[PDB]
Amino acid sequence: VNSFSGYLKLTDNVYIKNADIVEEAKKVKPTVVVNAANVYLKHGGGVAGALNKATNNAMQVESDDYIATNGPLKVGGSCVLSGHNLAKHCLHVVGPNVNKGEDIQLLKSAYENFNQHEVLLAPLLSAGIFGADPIHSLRVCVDTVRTNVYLAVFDKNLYDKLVSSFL
Ligand SMILES: CC1(C(=O)NNc2ncnc3nc[nH]c23)CC1
Ligand SMILES: CC1(C(=O)NNc2ncnc3nc[nH]c23)CC1
């Protein structure tokens, strides 16, 4: 038993809720919150901009030091950094950005990072401003992640569509 509430169960291990991931993170304090990162960890908008804003820019400060030491992530890759006031840890995961021409096949590789963590609060990778079809992203999530994932979907209209079309 864990503290996530109001989720609809899609599979053995995948759950989904219409929620703001920032508000869900601040209430749950999960062990891991996933950020929809880019390779530079520049948290300007979308989920990343919202998570970073909720940390009062501390996420960005930590991220800039990470990049200065390690260089950019790979598309499909990840790194574990602090969760600041939102979670114990933040798993920054880079899904492909269709608005940058990145290969959508890398979405499966991106979701594989989730398997290194027993439980995660996460957004749909490559959705929103990353330009992928969220229904496809949900399918890849279900078919790739084996650990317990709690998906927060900000848009109520999208949440209802994800649910109604789920196979
Ligand atoms: C959770 C998410 C998002 O953008 N939430 N909305 C807002 N977040 C932060 N400050 C806001 N001020 C008005 N709306 C705001 C999808 C990334
Ligand atoms: C329609 C929409 C979506 O479905 N997911 N993105 C997000 N998911 C969870 N929390 C978020 N806070 C800001 N954007 C968020 C916003 C792009």
Continuous H helices in 113-155: 134-144
The ligand with the least distance to the CA atom of 151 is 2
Q: Which of 154, 155, 157, 159 to mutate to test the pocket of ligand 1 (most atoms within 8 A of CB)?
A: 154
Domains, the chain, ordered by start: 8-165 (3.40.220.10)
Report the length, in residues, of the chain: 167
PDB resolution in Å: 1.1
Q: Look at residues 42, 149, 37 and name the one whose alpha carbon lies nearest to residue 95.
A: 37
Experimental method: X-ray
**The ligand 1 atom nearest the CA atom of 49:** 17
Kindly state the DSSP code that residue 55 receives in the 8-state scheme.
Answer: T
Round to whole Å and give the CA distance between 123 and 153: 6
In the structure encoding, which two tokens stand for residue 15, read together? 């759950």
Residue 125: CB partners within 8 Å, gap ≥ 6? 34, 36, 93, 95, 107, 110, 111, 132, 137, 140, 141
Q: Using the mean position of ligand 1's atoms as its centre, give its distance from the Cα of residue 50 in Å.
A: 5
Identify the residues whose C-beta falls under 6 Å from ligand 1: 20-22, 46-47, 50, 53, 154
Round to whole Å and give the CA distance between 120 and 132: 21
Query: Can you tell me whether residue 152 is helix, strand or coil?
Result: strand
Full DSSP string of 78-89: EEEEE-TTT-SE
Kindly state the DSSP code that residue 116 receives in the 8-state scheme.
Answer: G
How many CB atoms neighbour CB 100 within 10 A? Answer: 11
Round to whole Å and give the CA distance between 116 and 68: 25
Q: Which of 17, 18, 20 to mutate to test the pocket of ligand 1 (most atoms within 8 A of CB)?
A: 20
Task: Identify the helix (H) or strand (E) that includes residue 112.
Answer: helix 106-112
